[PDB]
Design a binder for these strands. Structure first.
Length: 79
RNA sequence: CAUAGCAUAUCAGAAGGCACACCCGGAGAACUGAAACAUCUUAGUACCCGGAGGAAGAGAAAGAAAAUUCGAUUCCCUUA
RNA sequence: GGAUCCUGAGUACGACGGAGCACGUGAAAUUCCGUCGGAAUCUGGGAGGACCAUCUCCUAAGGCUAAAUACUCUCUAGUGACCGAUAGUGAACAGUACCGUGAGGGAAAGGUGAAAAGCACCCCGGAAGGGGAGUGAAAUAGAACCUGAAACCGUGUGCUUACAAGUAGUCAGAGCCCGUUAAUGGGUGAUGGCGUGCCUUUUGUAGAAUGAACCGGCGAGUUACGAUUUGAUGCAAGGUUAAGCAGUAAAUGUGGAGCCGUAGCGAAAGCGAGUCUAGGGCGUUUAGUAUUUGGUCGUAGACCCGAAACCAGGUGAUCUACCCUUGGUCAGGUUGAAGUUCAGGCUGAAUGGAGGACCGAACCGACUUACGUUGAAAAGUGAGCGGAUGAACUGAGGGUAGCGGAGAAAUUCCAAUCGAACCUGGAGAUAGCUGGUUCUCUCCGAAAUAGCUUUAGGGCUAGCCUCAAGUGAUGAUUAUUGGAGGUAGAGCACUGUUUGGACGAGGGGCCGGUUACCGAAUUCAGACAAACUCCGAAUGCCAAUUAAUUUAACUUGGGAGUCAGAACAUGGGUGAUAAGGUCCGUGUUCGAAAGGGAAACAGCCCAGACCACCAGCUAAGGUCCCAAAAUAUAUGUUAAGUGGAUGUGGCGUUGCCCAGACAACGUCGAGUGACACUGCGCCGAAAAUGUACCGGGGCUAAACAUAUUACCGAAGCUGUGGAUUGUCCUUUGGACAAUGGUAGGAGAGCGUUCUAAGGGCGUUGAAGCAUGAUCGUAAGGACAUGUGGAGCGCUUAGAAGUGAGAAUGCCGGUGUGAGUAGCGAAAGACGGGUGAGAAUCCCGUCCACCGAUUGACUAAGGUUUCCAGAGGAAGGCUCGUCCGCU
RNA sequence: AGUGAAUAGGCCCAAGCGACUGUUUAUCAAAAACACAGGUCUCUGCUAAACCGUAAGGUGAUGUAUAGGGGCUGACGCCGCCCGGUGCUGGAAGGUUAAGAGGAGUGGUUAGCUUCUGCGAAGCUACGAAUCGAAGCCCCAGUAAACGGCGGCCGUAUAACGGUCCUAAGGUAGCGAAAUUCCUUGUCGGGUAAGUUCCGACCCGCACGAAAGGCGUAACGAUUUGGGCACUGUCUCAACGAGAGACUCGGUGAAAUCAUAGUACCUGUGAAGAUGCAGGUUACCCGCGACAGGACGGAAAGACCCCGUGGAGCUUUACUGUA
RNA sequence: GACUGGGGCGGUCGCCUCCUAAAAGGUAACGGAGGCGCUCAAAGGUUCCCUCAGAAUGGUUGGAAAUCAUUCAUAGAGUGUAAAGGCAUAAGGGAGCUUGACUGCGAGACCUACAAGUCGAGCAGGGUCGAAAGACGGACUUAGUGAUCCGGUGGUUCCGCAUGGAAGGGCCAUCGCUCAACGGAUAAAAGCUACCCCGGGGAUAACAGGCUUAUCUCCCCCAAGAGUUCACAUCGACGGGGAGGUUUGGCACCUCGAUGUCGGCUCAUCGCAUCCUGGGGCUGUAGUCGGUCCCAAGGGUUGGGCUGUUCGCCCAUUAAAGCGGUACGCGAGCUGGGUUCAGAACGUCGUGAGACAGUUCGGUCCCUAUCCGUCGUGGGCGUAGGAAAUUUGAGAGGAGCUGUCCUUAGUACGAGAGGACCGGGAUGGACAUACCUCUGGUGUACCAGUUGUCGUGCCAACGGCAUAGCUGGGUAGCUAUGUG
RNA sequence: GGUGACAGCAAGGAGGUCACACCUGUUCCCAUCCGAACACAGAAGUUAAGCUCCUUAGCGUCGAUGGUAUCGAACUUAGUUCCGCUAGAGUAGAACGUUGCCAGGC
């Protein structure tokens, strides 16, 4: 009988943290999924063209603090 | 004229029935499957017609092939 | 010898249209039919999957041709881990009885005994039937004849019953009567407690949702060939034969065509423990193969039953429609439209009497209304009513046939069937839909959800279940530690909403201006947000660990089911701050869960049933009687039984103060009167069978409260004995245990029929049938006795038409309704006769009925029914001595 | 009491629809439906057209336009504006452009006569001015008892005329609240009755315009619809008689149905409407006669509604074929 | 075609962003909001530099402001495209040179049923910008497509039929139309059933039951005033507020192997939210009139004309002509007018088959009562001796309604006309009950009489049949309209 | 002065060619309407400003203690109890940088 104008939405992307602080990761592992730079790269960490943070060596991840509010993620080598 | 044909005297050659099971011909569906349906499938099946034999049909290289060859046709097992 | 003539004509070949070849017409190469066109004669011509060449290969346009091969309506001889009378052929005695116009469809029905010795004779009886007696091993072996179950119907008897409320049982329990597989014995049962059948389908069924009257028989995952994965066994770098052959329709023997493996990779040439494009994929660091067993799958009808329909070949116009040829019927009345004589000046004295005429019988029809509706009748009867010389009614013959025919037209008719008749076949059509699907126990045990889908009550993969093999901390819960993150709450600093309160430059007041006033701006002043935040939890999430208790977790395989969910409490959307509403999220319980409480009451509270007991402690809820346990204590409230008002309850301050404050127009003496946060009340509150919520009786506590204690209360836990299975010290026992269950997965068994081998039994009595107070954890097994009169167990192995309570299942038998509905229109009375028997048969004498017919003929059609004598088993809606019956 | 019994038309006034006699759904419809005698329109020159057949052969018809086949319409009597498939026979003549012939002239190649370069003839080759002329170009210069419509707006409830868009006009008479109008029992009204649904009186034409005929009739009629007079148990309001059933006795003797039954009520509970559950209340056992409240009574696997990649029939400018 | 708080009509169907979403991720509805089916040879790369809308300040025309300088001026600027998350390392605004908007690959990871999708260090090769480190595999991030099959263009060191070219396959690169219902039935496809059939479903609608109560009927709570004026005698304006009972709707829990029907007829039984009668009171009741309330449930509560009607308007009455429940009480008790059936006429709308919901005429209502229940009537047994007759009454059921004439009284009262209440017996009535037949009447099927046709015994008189042939009277019994 | 580890904004006060700035420039490499920017060449005079030394907490930044709730559990169907973890406001209070490795000069 009636006409509903709404009814749209998109598929949810699975953004956010992917590995845990203190956890041993492997080289080229994805540590955080994000639109934008909610968290910056750090030591032995890169960013891809989707704003994806990733490791560059085999180590241990620590989330830390960059300036006064900016946050970053690093990987430190020796396990 | 002559054919056709009329008869006559002759041989009875046929006609009907069917084991339609098998075999050889003429004609020839649909439901169904494709998760609908039309090319396709069921299927050259069912059913109808003929011939009708004890078997029918095929068969003796204008080939198969590529070797050094087999060697008409028909049937079984492989290749599959 | 090898080319001097011959060497298979509308042929070969081409095109347009089709077809057959595994092949959808492309390269159709190869081969055929229709229409047309249409070459060559051996250094020729045709083929080798388009095609051009070298190479092979062959010589069409003529004919015949054994063997090895297919099938069985038949014949003779035989065979079977094939059926035994609802089976096996439809058919053991039938294409019959019967049904249909026809094509066509199509049953039920075996049994005396060894031998008829098949019951001489007497008694009762009209007879039938029986009682003796006889024959027989045996007549409860007598033809309704082997055995003889159950439903259902009776006669007798031990116990019990006329104040009683019900799924008919179970547990307790007197009284009376008995005496067995003699054992913690059997029958019946005053009286008390508890208790809403089964199956199916469902979120949920006592259900007023489905199915079944009862009892008996029959009635549903099979086989063949392939594939995958388990178990077993042989051989092993190998393993194994197929068809065929000699043998018995067996084993065995033989027979290496083939198939798998020992090596893979790449599209492929190819390379090779490597290869394809260093870094990568699939590989190498070896066990396979044959037969057989279990599970699942594929092609077959593939677990069983069930459509509406489609197609093919046939049957029917003896019903009905229209037509053709040849024949019949239509009582009586009424009426003067060109009839017609005379008389008059064209109507009077007169009067053929026609017509889809107009009243009415025969005949044809069917408008109203009553009756009838398990009918007298699958379309009728009574009373009225329409036509009744016409387009009338009707007989005998012939003709049109299903995409058809016929139709004064209604989808109306075509054999009681028609928007497409009937029969047989394809055919076991298809049915993602409903129903049904048959012995026992032990262990484990879901789901009602993603995603996609011409998909939405279906399916597929994932999730969750089960079984086996492997791997080894990788599993779970708490501590102590880091970490990612914007919800509750709060807050306005940003985006928007906000109400009051604010300041002058200026368009403006004017006669350019004043100034208040209109608008925006900034301004001090303060509430709000799912799509505002910077200031942020509790929890939940990931992880790491020399941080403690626990027993999981994962990978690869075989097998599934599930895809309708429900209430409750908490977080939210939608709706109305509705719904036993609807949609998500986090838990619980039902589903699939018995037990106790809530009166009753899947989903609420407590709690998870292996089995025995007339042992004990407790949970939730309870302790006056029903109905177990406190009429228990001590101490308080309640008087009501089940919007505001002076209603009352404190802590309070207080204005006026006994100098005399509120009244009576100075008497008067003890507080006055106010203003509130809180306790019980107050009205507040007005439906239909019958008191009606303590469930009832009843209660002033037996109400509601608080604080102690006592006790009762479950299938929870503990005692005692037992079973089956894990678990592991393994003394397999002492323990550590465990043991509700639907779809469904796994294991172990019980019975039935048949076969092999070995041992048994049986006329001194097999199987079957009936009874018993016996044994086994269950399905089930014995033994004793009676009946029966020739076959049947056990042990180990093998093979299946291997188990029924449900399908509005199929067939047979027998109930209930019930001594009930009905006995089909219609005159009978009396006397006599015959008879075992008479309302009913025969004979009277009366009396009634039809009275254009219930009369007499004549047809079609039917086929002996017709006459006489005998007879009453069945038939005849009662009877029967009678009869269309024998 | 004289048709002394039995038999034998009820009438009158007003309206629809159909001319009439006839025919029709065997078995819920007998009629306004179908026919009909007449009208019309069209096709057929005869081995006619048309129809059945694969065809041969047939019917039409042993007929021949005063004859035959098909459609519409229905006796009798009174009764135009229009052809629009982006437009259809006439008057016409200026025309334009398809196919074809017409050739003043005009070029690569040597391009003579002139090598001191130009009417360039003429060959193979490579182009081109005149003026003329088909259907269509035209309002395609017919058509309606053929499919059809009869316009929108606006002055205003092409309604009356009044200015209009564009076309073929978008209305002849006649009728005019309409088996058709919701507003609208239109407003007007009236005849009849005590009280309405008892009969036609303006145009104020949603849903109007003439053989898919518009108006009038005398006859009809088991047709529809009103109003009177007879007359009556139709009713007030029932009573009494006569028979057949019923009901008692002798005889004979079914059927649908059925899980087993020792089968009460009220309030409640519950798959939300209980003989069977809870709490109460009432009730000795067993028949016959009568009634119809409940056993969600019996009967027919709901015909309404939805669903199935189920079907059948019909239509069409659905898709694909084909006579 | 599907979805769908039944279906149809309507809307939608793929992808992106945000809320709902409960601080990881995920998460529904026909819940609430917006975008996409591209664009850019620079808006790409790399080396440099460089940094506010607005306000205030003034300034040659000043559309006030664009153009002009100074004070700021938190980024509020701005970023091609909606949103969110991020950016002054600018990822924003200029300049140079350029094309990395390259060729092979990739340890490992995110996401996920699958097929798809996402990110990547770094290793080769060959390069652009920068002096150099170094940076670069498009774009601040995330939308801008869609398998396979067939078909079409070019390379090749692949196969290719005996051998060899070779058309054709294979591989590598590159295209095009359609799949928007966007996991695409093969890339070709409309309607009416009212003759409708079969398989199913209370998984899902229409009636009745159940829940709810927006709506509906009512009961309470608070006020400017009208009313001459006096708020409250009368009404309550804008009004908003609490409740109670469930009648048009919301929901889809029983019933689709059937719970089968609207009005009327016959017969009831409950309620009170009272129509009459019965009590009372208030009055802005002079007085009858009346207004107005409260208490009160026993009994009563009508005859017709029109419409199928519920409902509704009208004529006459009456003391009065209430409002509700009971499957909108009652169809195994009745009818069948309305409406859901096959025929037909008209109107409108469709090409048409048909439809509408408009009309109009015509159209088949089954059942033998088992159990419980109800109304009547019997058999059995019982109860401390057996019988016959009289009784008591625990407890049940039935009956309680109405109107005239007479005082009173013409007194109260009425400046006028108009008219109080109140007391006695009685009275004879209307309905409905329950007796009965003496009276008026009905009927009388074995009673008396008159009469017409016919047939028998032959005149007549009888008897038979014509509805008891017909006509006129009528005993007992049974009766109303009669009497109590 | 340079680089390098975890507090600001401004407001009065002063102090010097050792720092570095203020200036002199168009003269050159640089370089744009403008040597206003950017370059380079001066180095005359100089703490007036930037720099630089407490500093004022006035603005700003941190941040207590009290304790005003939401997991768990019962009671109940209207929010009440026992727990554990405790916010945002807001008070007090601090606070005008601790200061890592070199030159020069101490």
């Amino acid at each position: 009988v009636s006409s509903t104008k709404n009814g749209r939405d998109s598929e949810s992307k699975r953004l956010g943290a992917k590995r845990a602080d203190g956890q041993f990761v492997t080289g080229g592992s994805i540590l955080y999924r994000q639109r934008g730079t909610k968290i910056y790269p750090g030591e032995n960490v890169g960013r891809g063209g989707d704003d994806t943070l990733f490791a560059k060596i085999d180590g241990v991840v620590k989330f830390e603090r960059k300036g006064r509010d900016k946050k970053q993620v690093s990987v430190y080598a020796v396990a």
